[PDB]
Write a protein that binds this ligand. Structure first.
Ligand SMILES: [Ca+2]
Ligand SMILES: [Ca+2]
Length: 757
């Protein structure tokens, strides 16, 4: 909440007594509107009496002040004298900087109960107007810092005693003369609640093109609780604030339109701000009101999906939501030949002296020895697909010795591709066609196998493959035809068990195979738009991107869902590489990266923070409750940042929670990242208390100590640069209520950059 005064120029209303303040003078002590050379302001005249303006707050207001903090900002001109007292006080302590001119005319500072005197300016600057800032950070061991003109003067100001309770400005001594023109005075009590519990899961972003427009989101949870409860209906909500986050328009439910009968639950509003059209693009997930992610009760045949809504910042209108599940929710039969070998065979009766046609739509997620095999009694044709240590798709054909680069662009390296095999009886050979691309021709080994076969061969070679369709035709008739895409999405009634459908499952060691994708969830915070992709291979500038959560069936992981199209068309990248281990038969041990956030780094690389959801230790190697991953290709594939997990943040909370990360861009040119997360009430604990904020000046290699932002409940949070000096912050606190913080990153940064001895 704000409390200020300012020189409007007009008569009647430029009086602090108009702008809500109180008069508190003693004889001769006067005030008056001055406008020196067009400089409108309130002149305080503490000649032979005190002239000072007060303002009185409520108990709850001071509590809020103690919980989330405050900041005081004064733009004034000290004309003469001393005991210029601009400060705040609550019934038990105050912070009192005394602004005055020394016998030598220089403007100087001194703090109550604090040894030392500091010259602010000298010469004729000493009577110039200046910016004066008092900044208070809540803590068990609190403090405040004082800034003069964006520089930091004193820090660690220990609060002293009083029983005075109010905000005050002017000359506070009756016996000490002081004269000053105040062009502006601002008092801000931090966290105004914008969204109330049990609504949860906020995110936020700001316009850079229309300075001041901020857009916040959360989940309207009617009944409270995570999506999937028969006892709730969750929707998405927003609030915009055209003034930096001071006031906010009415709460808008973007979803009720979409969910007529409240048959669905929506979740995870992940918006992205797009500078070219100057729009917010929010993406969020839908689930049926009775099943979702939790307990993995969500099935590929329920209404899980992803939808977006576009907000026109220029005219403040919203466009009805658009569904894009199709483009981003894969439907396929999936085979994970990790620590196992899994194969599906269909015995066929192909007349090998006559022609035949083979078609399979396959996608290689990772590894090798995933393969397709046609055998017509006499001979065998085998295409072994595998991914390079360079991240390229390669093909080993049978009998052949030389592998064939199949794809270089990482994006194509992990996308679907129609592999065709054309058999010519005539000259007794076949040819390979990857999406119209005639590759090679060859005559595989001789056998007595009359087969159509696919899967992962070696039990000692890990690979994973996803099938969508398989067909085999001879002389104008389809012998075999399997469409995973179609069945995946079918209700249990529709028979999809390969075995029962005709195939022979052949598997050694442990594997896992499933139909389609159970659900996609965009994620908690905000998304970005990439701008440093020019020297990155195959990525582009203007890419809209965000790390979504995929639930295959049982295990959760994260992938990118992006748009090089500006947003009309969407893509999907590979999943995070996780270390796996079978503790026993049918007992798998891996991580499950969930709530995730990314920042585009200076060189173009992508930096991701992900929360580790069910089990964080694999092979005795502990993974904190959080891990970082890096992508050097625009978010197509990632690589784990070994030993870049929770521990990277001193004093972070050992609990598992959602955090946030962003880029902060200084007008002067410099930049860095801002990172939010709770700390726990005592030294790095498992508790959602005292949200902190780390920075990183070296591009996420390291981070610098958590500066505390809150004293109390701190949960999910999201941060985004408001303007050149500010970062607005949105968190969950008491009873999950979501509060707003307007941080001055430019000033706070300084509490970390100085070296003293
Ligand atoms: Ca529900
Ligand atoms: Ca987040």
């Amino acid at each position: 909440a704000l409390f200020d005064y300012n020189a409007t120029g007009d008569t009647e209303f430029d009086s602090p007594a108009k702008q809500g303040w109180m008069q508190d003078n003693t004889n001769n002590g006067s005030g008056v509107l001055t406008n020196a050379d067009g400089m409108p302001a309130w002149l305080v005249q503490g000649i032979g009496g005190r002239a000072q303006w007060t303002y009185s707050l409520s108990t709850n207001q001071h509590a809020q002040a103690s919980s989330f903090g405050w900041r005081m900002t004064t733009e004034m001109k000290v004309l003469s004298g001393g005991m210029i007292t601009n400060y705040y006080a609550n019934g038990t302590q105050r912070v009192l900087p005394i602004i005055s001119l020394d016998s030598s005319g220089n403007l100087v500072v001194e703090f109550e109960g604090q040894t030392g005197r500091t010259v602010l300016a000298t010469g004729t600057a000493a009577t110039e107007y200046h910016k004066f800032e008092l900044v208070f950070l809540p803590g068990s061991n609190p403090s405040a810092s004082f800034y003069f003109d964006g520089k930091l003067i004193r820090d660690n100001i220990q609060p002293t005693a009083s029983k005075q309770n109010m905000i005050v400005w002017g000359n506070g001594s009756s016996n000490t003369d002081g004269v000053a023109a105040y062009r502006d005075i601002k008092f801000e009590i931090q966290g105004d609640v914008i969204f109330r519990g049990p609504d949860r899961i906020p995110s936020i972003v700001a316009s850079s093109v229309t300075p001041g427009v901020v857009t916040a989101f959360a989940e309207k949870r009617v009944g409270g609780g995570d999506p999937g409860a028969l006892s709730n209906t969750n929707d998405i909500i927003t609030r915009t604030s055209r003034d930096g986050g001071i006031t906010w328009d009415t709460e808008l439910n973007l979803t009720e339109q979409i969910n007529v009968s409240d048959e669905f639950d929506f979740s995870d509003p992940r918006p992205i701000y797009d500078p070219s059209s100057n729009t917010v693009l929010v993406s969020y997930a839908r689930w049926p009101t009775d099943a979702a992610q939790n307990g993995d009760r969500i099935k590929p045949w329920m209404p899980n999906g992803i939808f977006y809504s576009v907000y026109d910042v220029a005219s403040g209108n919203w466009q009805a939501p658009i569904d894009v599940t199709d483009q981003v929710k894969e439907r396929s039969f999936q085979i994970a030949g990790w620590g196992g070998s899994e194969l599906y065979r269909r015995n066929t009766s192909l007349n090998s002296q006559q022609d035949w046609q083979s078609n399979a739509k396959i996608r290689i997620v990772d590894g090798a020895a995933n393969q397709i095999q046609v055998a017509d009694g006499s001979r065998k044709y085998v295409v072994t697909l595998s991914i390079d240590e360079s991240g390229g798709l390669v093909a080993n054909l049978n009998g052949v010795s030389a592998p064939i680069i199949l794809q270089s662009e990482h994006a194509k390296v992990h996308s679907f591709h129609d592999y065709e095999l054309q058999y010519s009886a005539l000259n007794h050979t076949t040819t390979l066609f990857v999406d119209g691309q005639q590759i090679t021709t060859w005559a595989g080994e001789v056998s007595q196998e009359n087969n159509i076969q696919f899967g992962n061969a070696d039990a000692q070679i890990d690979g994973r493959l996803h099938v969508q369709k398989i067909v085999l035709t001879q002389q104008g008739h389809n012998l075999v035809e399997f469409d995973a895409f179609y069945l995946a999405q079918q209700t249990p009634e529709v028979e999809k068990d390969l075995e029962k459908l005709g195939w022979t499952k052949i598997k050694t060691g442990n594997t896992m195979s499933l139909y389609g994708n159970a659900s996609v969830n965009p994620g908690p915070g905000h998304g970005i738009t990439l701008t440093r992709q020019q020297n990155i291979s195959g990525s582009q500038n203007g890419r809209l991107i965000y790390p979504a959560i995929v639930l295959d069936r049982f295990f959760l992981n994260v992938m990118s869902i992006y748009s090089d199209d500006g947003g009309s068309n969407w893509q999907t990248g590979s999943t995070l590489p996780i270390p796996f281990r079978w503790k026993s038969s049918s007992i798998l041990e891996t991580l499950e990266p969930s709530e995730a956030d990314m920042v585009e780094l200076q060189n173009g690389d992508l930096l991701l923070t992900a929360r580790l959801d069910f089990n964080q230790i694999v092979n005795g190697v502990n993974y904190s409750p959080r891990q970082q991953f890096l992508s050097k290709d625009g978010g197509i594939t990632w690589s784990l940042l070994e030993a870049n997990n929770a521990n990277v943040f001193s004093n972070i909370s050992t609990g598992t929670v959602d955090a946030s990360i962003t880029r902060f861009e200084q007008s002067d040119g410099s930049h860095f990242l801002l990172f939010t997360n709770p700390q726990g009430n005592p030294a790095g604990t498992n508790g959602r208390q005292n949200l902190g904020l780390w920075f990183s000046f070296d591009e996420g290699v390291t981070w610098k100590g958590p500066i505390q932002l809150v004293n109390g409940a701190s949960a999910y949070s999201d941060i985004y640069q408001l303007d050149s000096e500010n970062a607005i912050v949105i968190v969950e606190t008491d009873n999950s209520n979501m509060r707003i913080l307007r941080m001055p990153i430019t000033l706070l940064k300084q509490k970390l950059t100085l070296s003293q001895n």
